[PDB]
């Protein structure tokens with residue numbers, strides 16, 4: 480899974496990921512990973528990216544999320560893969 484310490488990592492989304500988060504009502508510039516995942520959840524649900532037949536799949540090929548993450552789809556069960564994709568779109572804030 481993902482260690483608790485790592486969920487609490489402080490991060491500053493780069494401009495395009497920040498715009499995506501703000502488009503679903505995020506207000507800040509600095510987040511924990513846990514908060515980033517919250518707003519991605521909202522984004523995904525709002526843009527209706529979940530596959531109808533296989534609900535664990537986010538089909539993001541035709542969406543900005545697919546451009547940022549660099550994949551046509553991902554499974555919500557693949558946490559480490561997701562954290563890897565997110566990290567490419569942010570800067571980690573020391574301590």
Ligand SMILES: CN1C(=O)C(Cc2ccc(Cl)cc2)=C(c2c[nH]c3cc(Cl)ccc23)[C@@]1(O)Cc1ccc(Cl)cc1
Pocket residue numbers: 516517519520521523555556557558559561562
């Ligand atoms: C379908 N969902 C989940 O499986 C988890 C848990 C999850 C997902 C990805 C990773 Cl890397 C880790 C954990 C969710 C949520 C994640 N955080 C939340 C907070 C609230 Cl308050 C509600 C749902 C969720 C969510 O509800 C929504 C979701 C959030 C982020 C991503 Cl990338 C995909 C889906």
